[PDB]
């Protein structure tokens, strides 16, 4: 009624359901669709479906999903510093996770239901997109350990090939995914 | 008692499509009709405006006006603490836009404005803000309608 | 203006017309600084970097009373011929003021 | 607190006031931080200018001591009278007071106009320029510290 | 009962009367009478009575009343900030508003029903007091823009002259008003 | 409870002609009799005081005491919010007046005071404020009775 | 029900009883027992028992009890300022009161009902503990004016003697008391 989640109906509903997708209008104001608050949402079918996932999609799927969730969790702790000082004063190690969090939040969690191919997405396409994002993050961190500026990582053309993975058809995905993986591997080989 | 959790305003929200809210602050400042745009809302607006119904630029102009007023009111609240000299360049422009908006768009008295006159005044108000700060409006409408001066209604009370 | 350091720069300081005293050890510098702050009359005091890194760190029981004297650390003798880490000193300053120690 | 329907609305008005005050204080902190992160850069530049001036003054005095001799250097230090004309003013910054230094640096108040110990005269000029850069460092330092403490209070 | 304005009798009356004069307990505790809560009171006869005011008091009386109402509204708006951070954190252009609002509250709105003279006030005396307050506010706003501080304006000896215009009898007020207007004009003109 | 809005005190206050309210906060500080003057009221006070009954300055002194105590009470909350080091001189004067009022006027013990002694103590307390801030008192009574020190009676 | 002290049974009892011993859940959470709220409790029998105390315990016992109550009141007054500005900003004359209040709270008011000695306390033992605490406070207040730091006082070994005084049996206490008094005098005479 008043937007409060202590209502008797919501409290009685929270006690018997196995999933809870809490929408929020704060992400709808900024035109982020779907507007699911990933901090408050939960699901109790996560663990028990993993044998199906590893017997149907891929063996490393739960670990990759947990890695993406941990990347999203890491960015949530740095907002107390971004809301005090602007992003341009943050250390490069933290700036990397801020950029990767923005990339995840605006390329993987975002979905166009009005689009020709983006409205439908199978498990393997999402698995490939997560693989590409994790490869980007790990190679960027390895380059940081070598010693690089953040702007040369952001300069790389693989940002658009990791962004345009949503709009590829399901028939062209198994070639595009391997091409993008080899391209990012070579591009991070061509770095100091 | 200005309570929206009272049963009569609460149950009206479950059946009707939006609301229009009057403001006591605007009324006490001398503005008539004292309609506060921030809590007001219409839930069927997008189905009744647009190409061939009102005009091409209606929706984006309304969104830009809403966002600019929302910025201006908070800047006005901040000025009382930090002073008007500690502001940036665009913040003073936003503050002046908020004052002109309340003086000209809302406070119309007993005038009977057509939709063309309302859109003309709205486009003249947005010209105070610098071009390129109007993110919510596409560049074609800006090229077609930006740049008019508010003296056309300043001299017409 | 009062300034305590190695006498080799104190000589130039009294050449310029500024009051200068020599220091050689930590306890000597602390006693000299406490006598300088306790004695009234001046507005600015400069202390070294080799012996006492932070001047206001030791006079904390006295600086809370009056605020007109200003303390300030300067470089040493051999350090000025090669410089020091101004970036590190200001990073430490940003840590002590804003509390988060995150700046690049 | 007496439970009535009036007091409930009063409490809810107070809650709205508290939330809007939190937002306003956050905006004020943002403005303070934006000022601080330029003040610190000015402090950096002033500090390195002081470092260069320290380098040249120390070199000049070392060269004067090595050649002209400790006796004449000590005599020139003795001859020059001390300085006292430090002009101090108190100025507000963001609703708080600071002291400022506006030392006179008087011309003609020093002794020994003869330039026969030429390197001694150069060092006598250089250490006065040192003292000129010193208060330029100090006045930025005190303002920086005050703005930092205001940021701490707002937080 | 118990000062609860949500009582059925009070709510029934609110929907049929034309004017509402709500009294306050907090103002009555500090002996500030008539103790009218300005924020909770209203009148619906203001617009219909304007021709009579123009014909029988002055041609600009509604404008003066509107100016006083707007000043009170501005003070009520600033009271939130002054309760948040205190009075010394405001600028001079807001401290002037606070002090003028206090002058209005303790000079114009207050009235002693047991006093010999203050028990009755005519329309023209109130008009003169409003004019004096507005003239002082305009001059003080002009002086603030000229660099004069707030802390010296409110220590002028003319505030006692304005603050004690209540007790001037009806037979002496035409002289007192013209004596105070010239002093208001001259005090800020002579200031540095 | 400590509830003025309970039905019994509410109806009693609607029927009677004022009340004397006791304060637990004053009682915990060791003050007797712990009478809180602000929520207290006497409706028939104006009939029995004034010229020819007690003294001609009674009512104005009472009103001025009420206003000054209310100002001091309100300044206490500002002190509790922002700290007592950011006050001006006038606020500190009101704070000292409130503390002295509680410690000297209200707290009297088992002794029996006459009306003249009480008025003398009241005028002693009012003399701690500037002469220009006594707005509710006529200038003749101020000229007649102002200036006496509190230590001439309690010192 | 729920700790609500405005329920009818609680309010009906307070109109007839002479003593009101109020318990607090906050003190019981941190294992501070007997968890008596010394700010909300009262007793109407205190003034009628003074002739018994003056002739059965000591002639100056009421003065000592009043002094301890005053110290508790001052500590409660300072703890409002402490929790928003920090204890380091306070003067020495206030940090001394804070430390003495903590010593009173943890050495005198706290009592263990399951200990073999602390379960029972005579009147003379409590009077001796009160005397020791007040003597220490007097000496520390005297020595603060000579410029001694609070940290020098807090590290005195005699602070442990007062804290262990309540575990001393009733037989050994009259000698332990004299040793502690002489130790306090010696430690604050040899102090810097």
Curated annotation (Swiss-Prot), chains A, E, G:
Q: Which residues of the full protein are shown?
A: 387 to 578 of 578
**What job does the chain carry out?**
Produces ATP from ADP in the presence of a proton gradient across the membrane. The V-type alpha chain is a catalytic subunit.
* Protein name, per record: V-type ATP synthase alpha chain
* Family according to the record: Belongs to the ATPase alpha/beta chains family.
What's the superkingdom here? Bacteria
State which gene encodes it. Answer: atpA
Taxonomic lineage: Bacteria, Thermotogati, Deinococcota, Deinococci, Thermales
From Swiss-Prot, chain C:
Which biological process, per GO, is one annotated for this protein? proton motive force-driven plasma membrane ATP synthesis
Domain of life per record: Bacteria
Q: Which UniProt keywords are given for this protein, alphabetically ordered?
A: ATP synthesis, Hydrogen ion transport, Ion transport, Transport
> Sorted alphabetically, which Pfam families does this protein's record hold?
ATP-synt_F
* MF term (GO), any: proton-transporting ATP synthase activity, rotational mechanism
Q: What does this protein do?
A: Produces ATP from ADP in the presence of a proton gradient across the membrane.
Family as reported in the entry's similarity comment: Belongs to the V-ATPase F subunit family.
Q: From the Swiss-Prot or TrEMBL record, give the protein name.
A: V-type ATP synthase subunit F
Whichever gene encodes this chain, its name is atpF
Curated annotation (Swiss-Prot), chain D:
Q: Which UniProt keywords apply?
A: ATP synthesis, Hydrogen ion transport, Ion transport, Transport
Q: Does the keyword Acyltransferase apply?
A: no
The UniProt entry's GO biological process terms, in alphabetical order, are: proton motive force-driven plasma membrane ATP synthesis
One GO term in the molecular function aspect is: proton-transporting ATP synthase activity, rotational mechanism
Q: What does this protein do?
A: Produces ATP from ADP in the presence of a proton gradient across the membrane.
| Entry similarity comment | Belongs to the V-ATPase D subunit family.
Q: What is this protein called?
A: V-type ATP synthase subunit D
Q: Which organism is it from?
A: Thermus thermophilus (strain ATCC 27634 / DSM 579 / HB8)
The record lists the lineage as: Bacteria, Thermotogati, Deinococcota, Deinococci, Thermales
Report the portion of the entire protein shown: 4 to 158 of 223
Swiss-Prot record, chain F:
* Organism superkingdom: Bacteria
**Disulfide-bond pairs as recorded:** none
**What is the stated purpose of this protein?**
Produces ATP from ADP in the presence of a proton gradient across the membrane. The V-type beta chain is a regulatory subunit.
Family per UniProt? Belongs to the ATPase alpha/beta chains family.
Tell me the protein's name.
Answer: V-type ATP synthase beta chain
Q: Summarize which stretch of the complete protein this chain spans.
A: 318 to 472 of 478
